[PDB]
Amino acid sequence: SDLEALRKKIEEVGMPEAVKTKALKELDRLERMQQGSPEATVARTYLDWLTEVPWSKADPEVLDINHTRQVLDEDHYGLKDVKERILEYLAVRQLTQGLDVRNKAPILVLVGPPGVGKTSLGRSIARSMNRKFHRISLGGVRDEAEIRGHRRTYIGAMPGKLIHAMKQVGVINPVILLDQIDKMSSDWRGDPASAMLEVLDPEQNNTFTDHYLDVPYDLSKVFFITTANTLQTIPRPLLDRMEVIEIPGYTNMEKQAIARQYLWPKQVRESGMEGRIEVTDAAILRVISEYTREAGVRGLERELGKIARKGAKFWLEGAWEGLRTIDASDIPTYLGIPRYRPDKAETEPQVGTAQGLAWTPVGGTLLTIEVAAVPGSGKLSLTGQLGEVMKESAQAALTYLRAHTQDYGLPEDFYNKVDLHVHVPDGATPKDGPSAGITMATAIASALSRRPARMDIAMTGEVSLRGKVMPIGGVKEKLLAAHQAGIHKIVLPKDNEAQLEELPKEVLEGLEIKLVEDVGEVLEYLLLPEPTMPPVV
Amino acid sequence: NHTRQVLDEDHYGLKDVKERILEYLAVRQLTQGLDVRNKAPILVLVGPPGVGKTSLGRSIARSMNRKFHRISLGGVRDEAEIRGHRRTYIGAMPGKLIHAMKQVGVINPVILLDQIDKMSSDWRGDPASAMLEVLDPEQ
Amino acid sequence: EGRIEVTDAAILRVISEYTREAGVRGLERELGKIARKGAKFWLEGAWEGLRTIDASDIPTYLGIPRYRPDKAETEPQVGTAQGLAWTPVGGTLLTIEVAAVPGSGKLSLTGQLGEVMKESAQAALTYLRAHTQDYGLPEDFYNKVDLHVHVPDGATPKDGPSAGITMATAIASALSRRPARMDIAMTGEVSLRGKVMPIGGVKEKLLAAHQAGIHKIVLPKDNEAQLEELPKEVLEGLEIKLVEDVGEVLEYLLLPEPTMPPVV
Amino acid sequence: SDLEALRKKIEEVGMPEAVKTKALKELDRLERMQQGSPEATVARTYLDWLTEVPWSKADPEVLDINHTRQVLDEDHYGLKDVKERILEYLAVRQLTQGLDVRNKAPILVLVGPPGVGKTSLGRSIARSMNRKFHRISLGGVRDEAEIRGHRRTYIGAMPGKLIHAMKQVGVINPVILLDQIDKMSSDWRGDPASAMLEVLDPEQNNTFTDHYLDVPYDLSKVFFITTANTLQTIPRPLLDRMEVIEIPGYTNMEKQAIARQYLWPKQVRESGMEGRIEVTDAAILRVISEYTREAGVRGLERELGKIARKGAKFWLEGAWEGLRTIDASDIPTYLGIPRYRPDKAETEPQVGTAQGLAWTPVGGTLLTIEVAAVPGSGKLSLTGQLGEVMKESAQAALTYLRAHTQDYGLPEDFYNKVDLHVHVPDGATPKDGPSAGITMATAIASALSRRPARMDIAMTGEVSLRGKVMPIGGVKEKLLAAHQAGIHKIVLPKDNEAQLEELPKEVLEGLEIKLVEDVGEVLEYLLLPEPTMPPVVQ
Amino acid sequence: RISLGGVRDEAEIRGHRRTYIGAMPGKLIHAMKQVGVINPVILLDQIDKMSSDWRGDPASAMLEVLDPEQ
Numbered sequence A: 001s002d003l004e005a006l007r008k009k010i011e012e013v014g015m016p017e018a019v020k021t022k023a024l025k026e027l028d029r030l031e032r033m034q035q036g037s038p039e040a041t042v043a044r045t046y047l048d049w050l051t052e053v054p055w056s057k058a059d060p061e062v063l064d065i066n067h068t069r070q071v072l073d074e075d076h077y078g079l080k081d082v083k084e085r086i087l088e089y090l091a092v093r094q095l096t097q098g099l100d101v102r103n104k105a106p107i108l109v110l111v112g113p114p115g116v117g118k119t120s121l122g123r124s125i126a127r128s129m130n131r132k133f134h135r136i137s138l139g140g141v142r143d144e145a146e147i148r149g150h151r152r153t154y155i156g157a158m159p160g161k162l163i164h165a166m167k168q169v170g171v172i173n174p175v176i177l178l179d180q181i182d183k184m185s186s187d188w189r190g191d192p193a194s195a196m197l198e199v200l201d202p203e204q205n206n207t208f209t210d211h212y213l214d215v216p217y218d219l220s221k222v223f224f225i226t227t228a229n230t231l232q233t234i235p236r237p238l239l240d241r242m243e244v245i246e247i248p249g250y251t252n253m254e255k256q257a258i259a260r261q262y263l264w265p266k267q268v269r270e271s272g273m274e275g276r277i278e279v280t281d282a283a284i285l286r287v288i289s290e291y292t293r294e295a296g297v298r299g300l301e302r303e304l305g306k307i308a309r310k311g312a313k314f315w316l317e318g319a320w321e322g323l324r325t326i327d328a329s330d331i332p333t334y335l336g337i338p339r340y341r342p343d344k345a346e347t348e349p350q351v352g353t354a355q356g357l358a359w360t361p362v363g364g365t366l367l368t369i370e371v372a373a374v375p376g377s378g379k380l381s382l383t384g385q386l387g388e389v390m391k392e393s394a395q396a397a398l399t400y401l402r403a404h405t406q407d408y409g410l411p412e413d414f415y416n417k418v419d420l421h422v423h424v425p426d427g428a429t430p431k432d433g434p435s436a437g438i439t440m441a442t443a444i445a446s447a448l449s450r451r452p453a454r455m456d457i458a459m460t461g462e463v464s465l466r467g468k469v470m471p472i473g474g475v476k477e478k479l480l481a482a483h484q485a486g487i488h489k490i491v492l493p494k495d496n497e498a499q500l501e502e503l504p505k506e507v508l509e510g511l512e513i514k515l516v517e518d519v520g521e522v523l524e525y526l527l528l529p530e531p532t533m534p535p536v537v
Numbered sequence B: 001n002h003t004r005q006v007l008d009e010d011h012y013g014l015k016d017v018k019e020r021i022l023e024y025l026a027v028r029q030l031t032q033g034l035d036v037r038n039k040a041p042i043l044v045l046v047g048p049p050g051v052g053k054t055s056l057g058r059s060i061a062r063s064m065n066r067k068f069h070r071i072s073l074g075g076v077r078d079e080a081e082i083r084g085h086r087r088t089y090i091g092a093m094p095g096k097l098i099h100a101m102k103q104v105g106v107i108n109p110v111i112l113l114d115q116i117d118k119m120s121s122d123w124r125g126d127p128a129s130a131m132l133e134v135l136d137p138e139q
Numbered sequence C: 001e002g003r004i005e006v007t008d009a010a011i012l013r014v015i016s017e018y019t020r021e022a023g024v025r026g027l028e029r030e031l032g033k034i035a036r037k038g039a040k041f042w043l044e045g046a047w048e049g050l051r052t053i054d055a056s057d058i059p060t061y062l063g064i065p066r067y068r069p070d071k072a073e074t075e076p077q078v079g080t081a082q083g084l085a086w087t088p089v090g091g092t093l094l095t096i097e098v099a100a101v102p103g104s105g106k107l108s109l110t111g112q113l114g115e116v117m118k119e120s121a122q123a124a125l126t127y128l129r130a131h132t133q134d135y136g137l138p139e140d141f142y143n144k145v146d147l148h149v150h151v152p153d154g155a156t157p158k159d160g161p162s163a164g165i166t167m168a169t170a171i172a173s174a175l176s177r178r179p180a181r182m183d184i185a186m187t188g189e190v191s192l193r194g195k196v197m198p199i200g201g202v203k204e205k206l207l208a209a210h211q212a213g214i215h216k217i218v219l220p221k222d223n224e225a226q227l228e229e230l231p232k233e234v235l236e237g238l239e240i241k242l243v244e245d246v247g248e249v250l251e252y253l254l255l256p257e258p259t260m261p262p263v264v
Numbered sequence D: 001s002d003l004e005a006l007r008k009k010i011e012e013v014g015m016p017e018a019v020k021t022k023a024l025k026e027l028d029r030l031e032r033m034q035q036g037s038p039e040a041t042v043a044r045t046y047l048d049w050l051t052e053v054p055w056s057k058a059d060p061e062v063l064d065i066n067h068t069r070q071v072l073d074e075d076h077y078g079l080k081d082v083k084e085r086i087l088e089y090l091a092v093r094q095l096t097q098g099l100d101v102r103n104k105a106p107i108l109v110l111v112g113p114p115g116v117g118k119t120s121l122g123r124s125i126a127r128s129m130n131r132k133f134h135r136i137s138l139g140g141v142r143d144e145a146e147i148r149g150h151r152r153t154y155i156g157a158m159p160g161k162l163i164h165a166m167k168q169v170g171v172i173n174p175v176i177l178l179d180q181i182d183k184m185s186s187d188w189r190g191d192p193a194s195a196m197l198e199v200l201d202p203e204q205n206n207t208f209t210d211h212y213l214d215v216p217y218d219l220s221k222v223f224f225i226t227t228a229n230t231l232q233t234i235p236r237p238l239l240d241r242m243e244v245i246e247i248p249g250y251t252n253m254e255k256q257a258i259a260r261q262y263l264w265p266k267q268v269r270e271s272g273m274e275g276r277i278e279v280t281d282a283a284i285l286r287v288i289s290e291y292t293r294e295a296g297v298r299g300l301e302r303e304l305g306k307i308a309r310k311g312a313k314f315w316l317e318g319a320w321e322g323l324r325t326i327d328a329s330d331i332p333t334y335l336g337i338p339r340y341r342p343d344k345a346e347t348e349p350q351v352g353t354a355q356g357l358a359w360t361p362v363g364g365t366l367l368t369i370e371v372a373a374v375p376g377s378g379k380l381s382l383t384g385q386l387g388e389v390m391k392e393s394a395q396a397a398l399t400y401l402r403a404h405t406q407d408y409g410l411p412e413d414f415y416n417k418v419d420l421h422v423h424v425p426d427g428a429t430p431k432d433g434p435s436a437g438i439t440m441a442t443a444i445a446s447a448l449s450r451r452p453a454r455m456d457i458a459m460t461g462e463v464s465l466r467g468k469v470m471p472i473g474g475v476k477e478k479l480l481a482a483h484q485a486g487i488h489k490i491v492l493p494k495d496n497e498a499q500l501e502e503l504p505k506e507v508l509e510g511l512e513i514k515l516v517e518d519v520g521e522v523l524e525y526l527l528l529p530e531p532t533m534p535p536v537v538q
Numbered sequence E: 001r002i003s004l005g006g007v008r009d010e011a012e013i014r015g016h017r018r019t020y021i022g023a024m025p026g027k028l029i030h031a032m033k034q035v036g037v038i039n040p041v042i043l044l045d046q047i048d049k050m051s052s053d054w055r056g057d058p059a060s061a062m063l064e065v066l067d068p069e070q
C-alpha cells in the first residue's frame, strides 16, 4: 500500500546509501509486524521522520557584504557599531569559503537586555542571505534529551529539537537562532550544554548523531546565531568558541526613531488600520517616558499595539473619516492614566537621600537609597531586602564615616547616641551587591550632617575603610537608565574610566561624568555646604 | 456594534474583558483583506476552572452568526487522536476535529477549543505538535 | 421546577456567608444543595404554590454561616488601623493593632508576619521616630516604651509591604492617643521618607472593602491608573483619597484631640 | 492449551465490541512473541488483568427504603441525627435514580476521630442495598500514579487502587469506601486528588481509566462512601463536591450503651465464650474510664476484647460449672493496674494556672497551662514545645495585660522585675495554635495578680490585642473532651455561638457555656477576688 | 518456614506460569510439598521486608493466600 508508495518516496528523496540500506531493512522488517502493534506505530513513525528531514535539498543563497550591509540598514535603526561589527565578523567567514579548511564556526552570541532586536537581526541576516530562518529557544532546558533525544526504544520517544527544527525548515541550510542560550538549567540530572558542543564543533558536527534517528546527520552548512542577556551563565566550553556582539539597549531618542520607522507603522498595518490613524512624535515620547520601563523596546511595541488595535474598534463604531491623528494629550484616552508620571524626584536635594543605579540582565534601574538618623543607642537597621554583601558595604561606609568625624560635618558622638536606618525601596524586590558603596555613604552623611544632598546626580562605586572608591561593573547598562530617567550628571570610580569607551558615543556629551578616585570627593560634589534641619541632639 | 450588543445581552459585567475581545474582533475585520498581512493571533481565554470560559465563545458565535462547536483537548493522548489512526488496519476512524468537523455541516463555522494546556504530552503520540499544523494558515 | 425560588439578597447571602472562592463552582453546589433540600422538605412534606426563600430561611437549607461577614466596626479606636489584603481567591479586609506600654524600645511584631512586612513596620516606626514633634508624639518615646504590632488572626500567615501606611497610622495613634478613624481603609507602601509607593491587587482590595460596607479609601497616586478596572457602579459609591505622601494620611485619619491619658 | 481455551472464554465476559477487538489484537501479538519471553509474559498479565476486571456482572440492587433505616438501628447505638442525615441523603438519591439526569449526586464523607465507627456505618449501608463491600485506604499517597496507574507495556506498571478494588470486588456495582481521603500527600510526583475528580465527577467517571488499562471503565455504576478525620486537609476541589456528615465522639454514658449492647457480647461471641462469661455494667465503666483516653470506642473494643481472651484462657485452665461475672473489683485481674486517674485534674483554685482545650484529627484533649512569676528582669520564656503561633499568642496576651495594670490591679513595676515562664505539659508533644490566648491571659494574670484561677472551667478563645476575643476552631471536639474529663463549665467566644447548634444534645445537656466577646469577662469570671500568695515583690 | 526476604515479584507466592521447566510454583506449594501434609503450621518470616517494584505486588498475592474467603 502507501508503504509501497513509501518505498518509491524514500528513493526519490536523496540520502546517503547507508541510510537507504538501513531504511529499506526497516521497511521490510516492518511488513511482517502485524499492523496496529504499538511497535508497528513506532517503527512507522521513525520511517516517516527519516523521510521528512532535509537530506539533500538546497536553497539559493548569497553573500554580498554590501548588499547585506544595505539590508541591515533597510531593517534596523542605528546600531552602527553593532552593524559594522557583524560584517567585520561575517567577512572572515567569507575567506573560509568552506575551504579553510580549518577554523570555521567561531559562532556568534548577541548579548543584551531583552527587547533589543537580537532575534530581529537574526531574521534580517537570513533573508539577507536569502536563506531560511528558524527560532529554537533554549530557555531553562534541563536535559540532554531535548537536543540529542531519547532512543527510539523508550516511551514517548522523540528526536531532539535539532532534528525537529530541520524537518520543519524544509531545507539543509537555514539560519538558526538559539536564544535563551544562557537560560539552560545545568546538569541537575546531566549536562545538556555538551550536546550543543556536538552541534557547534565544525569537525564534530558533520556527523551529528541524534539518538531517535540512528543515522549521523550533517549540520556542516547551517549558520548558527545565539542570544543571551549575560555571559555569566554560559559554560566556558561554549563560551570560548563565540565572538561577542553587545546590543545593550536604546535611548528615548533612539527608541522614538525606531518607533516611527518600524514599530508604529507595523502595528497600524498589522491592525488593518493603515492610513486612518497616526501618532505625533510628541505622543510617542509620552509613550516611552510614561508607559514603559526597560532598556530595549519590547514594551513600546506592546503599548503602540494597544493604541492601533483600540483605533480599529473606535473607527468601526466609529468617529472619523481620514486621519484622527494623535498627540500627547490624546494618549491617556487610548492608553490609560500614565504609569510613571512624576514629577521626580523632586531633585531639590533632600536629607538622607542619595541616588544610586543598579542593573541586571533585563536592564539597569535607577533606585533611591534612604537613611534616617534618629536619636537612640547606635543601633543600625538595614531593610529593603538587602542581600548580605550590600549590608557589609553599609558597614564599610558607616565605619569610614565613623573614623573621620571632624573632616566632614558629623556629630562626634552618634556612634553611641543615634540609630541609623538604611532603606532602599521598593520593599519586596531583593537587592544586593557592593557597587553602591559610596552612595550609602553620601546618604548617611546627609542624614547625620542634616545637609541636603543633590538629587540631579546619580552615582556608583564601591568603598573601603581607607575610603577608596573601587571599580565596579555594569557601567553602560546603569548609565543608559540614568539617561532615560532624565539624569545627566553621573559619578564614577576612576578605574572605571575605561568602560566609558564601550558606551555609544552620542550620549557621552549628554552626560557629565565626574571620576572620583577617593570617597571624600563624592561627598563634596553631592552635599550642599549649609544644613537645613536642626542637628539631631 | 452589533456584536457589542450581544455580550451586554448574554454576559453581565466584564466591561474590560468585553472590550478586549472587541478589539481582537475589530482588528480582525480590518485585516481581513489580509494579503500579505494575516497571520493573526489566535485567542486564549485563560481563567481559573469554574468561571464560564466557554460561554464567551457562544456569545461571539451568536454574534458572528456562524455555527458553534466545542471539543476538549486536556487529557488527550494521540496524534491520530487528532486525525485518523489509519484508513484500514487499526480499529480506526478519523477524529477528533475531523468527525466533529462534520458534526456541524458548514465550512465557515466556529470551533472553540479548551483545556489545550491540559492535553497529554509525553505519555505518547504528541498532538501538541499536531495542533500547530492544525491552526497555522501556512499548510 | 416551579416548586421554589430565592430572594436575590438570599443569593447575596449564599455567596458571602457560604462561598469564599473566585469561582461559581462553590456556588452551583450551594445552589445545588438548596434545591435538593427542597425535595426532602417535599418528600418529608408537600406544599402547593411557590415557597420563596429570604436570607433568613437559608440557614435551614443545610446552611450555617461557615464564612462570616467582614462587616466592620466603624467607630474609631486607639491603636488600630483598617487594612486591605489580597489572596488568589479574593480580597480580604484586615485590621492592624498596636500597643503602647511602658518599656525600653523593644519592638515585637506578631501575627505570622513575613520578613518583608516586618521591615515595613521598621521603616514606618523609624520615620515617626524622626517627626515626633510634628505628629504630637513624645519627644523620646523610643527610649521609654516597648511596642507591639499585631494582625489577627494568628493562624493565617501574612507578608507584603502595602501595609506600611496602615501600620504607621496605627502606630501613630498608639503613642499619640488620638483615635484613628475606621470609616477608612488603607493600602500603601511607605519609604523611610514617608513617600507612598504604588501597590498591587487594587481591584480585589477595594471590592473586598466595598462589600465590607466602607466607602472611604486611601490609595497612592501611582495606583490611580488602576481605578479603571472596578465597575462604575462600585465606583459611584467610592470616596477615594489619593496620596503622594504619608503625612497626608495621618492628618486625614487621626482624630484631632487625644482621648486617653499618656503612658505615665 | 486451555490457555488457548482461556482465550475463548474471554469473549464471554462482555466488553463493548471496541474493547473486545482491542483485546483480540493484543492477544495475537502475544502469540507472535517468543512465548515464552519477557514481554510475552507481561502481555499475558495485562491480558489477564484486562479480561478479569468486572464487566457488567452486576448484582441485584436492593432499593433504599425504611428498611435501610433499621439495618442502621441494630448495627449502632445512638447517632439519632447522623442516621437521619444518611437516610435523607439516600431519599434524594432515589429521585436522581428517578433519572431526571442520569446522575448529579454529591459523594459523602464521614468525619470523626478514629473509633467512632465511620468505617462500619458504610459497611452496614452496603448491607442495606445488598451490595458487596470493599475498603480502600487512601493515606498516605505521594503519587497521583497509584490511583491512575502506569503505562501498559512500560514494561514496569501495575494498574492501581481503583482497578484492583473493582476487579477484586468482582461485581459492577459494589459500595466502595475511600478511607482516609484526607491523608493523601499530593506532593510530587503529582497530585493524586486531581485523579479522583475523574473517578468522582460522573462526567469522566463513566469514561476515563487506568493508564495500565487502555480503556474506559464506567465507574458511574459504583457507589462511593468516604472517610476522613478532619475536613481541613481535603482539597477544596474535592471538598466542594461532597456532602458532609459529622461524627465527633461519644460521652461516657453513650459509651456504656455501645459497650453492653454491642461491644461486650460481640467479643464474647468471637471468643467462643458465649454464655460462660459476663461483665457487670459498672465493670464496663471502670474499663471505659480507667483504661482508655480516646474519643472513639476502638480503645474500648480492644480492652473488652482482652477480657474475653483472658476469659477463655482461664476457663480452659479451669471451670465455672458454670457462669462467671466480673464487677469493678475483679477487673485489674484481667487488665492490670489502671494507669488513668479517670477524673480529674484537681479542680481547685490554683495560683498561676488555667484550663485549656486543644484538638487533633485524633481527638480532643483537656490541657493545663502553667505560668510562674518569679522575681526578675523582664524575660519571657515559653517552654512546653510551643510552635511559633502559640508563642506569639502568649506575647499578644501579655501585652494586653501590660496596658491595663490599673484595671486588673497587677503590679505596675513588673516587666523589669519579673520573669514569666509559660509551660504546657506534657513537654514531649508538639503543641501550637492561637485559641489559647485567653487561657494564657488568665494564667499569666493569675500569676502576677496572685489570685487563684478557677479550674472547674475550661476555655478556648483567641485574644486579639485590643482585648477582643476571637472566634475559634474545633468547637465540638474540644467540648466533648471536656465532658469526658469531668469539667462542666466552658468559656467560649460569642462569635463561636453558631457552632453550638451542631453539638449533640447529650453533651449540650451536661454543660454550661459562657459566651464572651471581650477578655475582661474571662478574667472576671475565672479569677477569685482576693489573692492567696504575697505579691511577687515589695 | 517460608522466607519472604526481599521477595520482589509474584513469581513465588504465585507460581511461574508454566510455559517452561525453568518456571516453577510459588513458595507455598514448595512448602506444602516438603511437609507431607495439608495442615502444617507455616510461618512466613519477615513479612514486612517484601516490596513490589517490578512484577505486580506480592502483597496482593499474600492476601489471596491468607483470605479465608478465597
Ligand SMILES: *[B]([O])([O])[C]([C]C1=[C][C]=[C][C]=[C]1)[N]C(=O)[C]([C]C1=[C][C]=[C][C]=[C]1)[N]C(=O)C1=[C]N=[C][C]=N1
Pocket: A356, A357, A358, A359, A360, A365, A367, A424, A429, A430, A431, A432, A433, A434, A435, A436, A472, A473, A474
Ligand atoms: B552594584 O553591585 O553594581 C549594584 C548593587 C546595587 C546597589 C544599590 C542598589 C541596587 C543595586 N548591583 C546591582 O544593581 C545589582 C546586581 C549585582 C548585585 C551584586 C553584585 C553585582 C551586581 N542589582 C540589583 O540589586 C537590582 C537590580 N534591579 C532591581 C533591583 N535590584
Ligand SMILES: *[B]([O])([O])[C]([C]C1=[C][C]=[C][C]=[C]1)[N]C(=O)[C]([C]C1=[C][C]=[C][C]=[C]1)[N]C(=O)C1=[C]N=[C][C]=N1
Pocket: C083, C084, C085, C086, C087, C092, C094, C117, C151, C156, C157, C158, C159, C160, C161, C162, C163, C187, C199, C200, C201
Ligand atoms: B500589600 O503588600 O499589598 C499586602 C500586605 C498586607 C496587607 C494587609 C495585611 C497584611 C499584609 N499584601 C497582601 O495583600 C498580602 C499578599 C501579598 C503579599 C506580597 C505581595 C503581594 C501580595 N496578603 C497577605 O499576606 C494575606 C494574609 N492573609 C490573608 C490574605 N492576605
Ligand SMILES: *[B]([O])([O])[C]([C]C1=[C][C]=[C][C]=[C]1)[N]C(=O)[C]([C]C1=[C][C]=[C][C]=[C]1)[N]C(=O)C1=[C]N=[C][C]=N1
Pocket: C155, D356, D357, D358, D359, D360, D363, D364, D365, D367, D424, D429, D430, D431, D432, D433, D434, D435, D436, D472, D473, D474
Ligand atoms: B486552638 O488553635 O484551637 C488550639 C490552641 C491550643 C491550646 C492549648 C494547647 C495547644 C493549642 N490549638 C489546637 O487545638 C492545636 C491544633 C491547632 C493548631 C493551630 C490552629 C488550629 C488547631 N492542638 C494541639 O496542638 C494539640 C496538642 N496535643 C494534643 C492535642 N492537640
Ligand SMILES: Nc1ncnc2c1ncn2[C@@H]1O[C@H](COP(=O)(O)OP(=O)(O)O)[C@@H](O)[C@H]1O
Pocket: A075, A076, A077, A078, A079, A113, A114, A115, A116, A117, A118, A119, A120, A121, A258, A262, A263, A297, A298, A301
Ligand atoms: N534597532 C531596532 N530597529 C528596529 N526595530 C527594532 C530594533 N530593536 C528591536 N526592534 C523591534 O522590536 C521588536 C523586539 O525585538 P526582538 O527581535 O524581540 O529583540 P530580542 O530578540 O533581543 O528580544 C522586534 O519586532 C523588532 O522589529
Ligand SMILES: Nc1ncnc2c1ncn2[C@@H]1O[C@H](COP(=O)(O)OP(=O)(O)O)[C@@H](O)[C@H]1O
Pocket: D075, D076, D077, D078, D079, D113, D114, D115, D116, D117, D118, D119, D120, D121, D258, D262, D263, D296, D297, D298, D301
Ligand atoms: N455507635 C456505635 N454503636 C455500636 N458499635 C460501634 C459504634 N461505634 C463504633 N462501634 C464499633 O466499634 C468498632 C470501631 O469502629 P470503626 O468502624 O473501626 O471506627 P472508624 O470508622 O473510626 O474506623 C467497630 O467494630 C464498630 O462495630
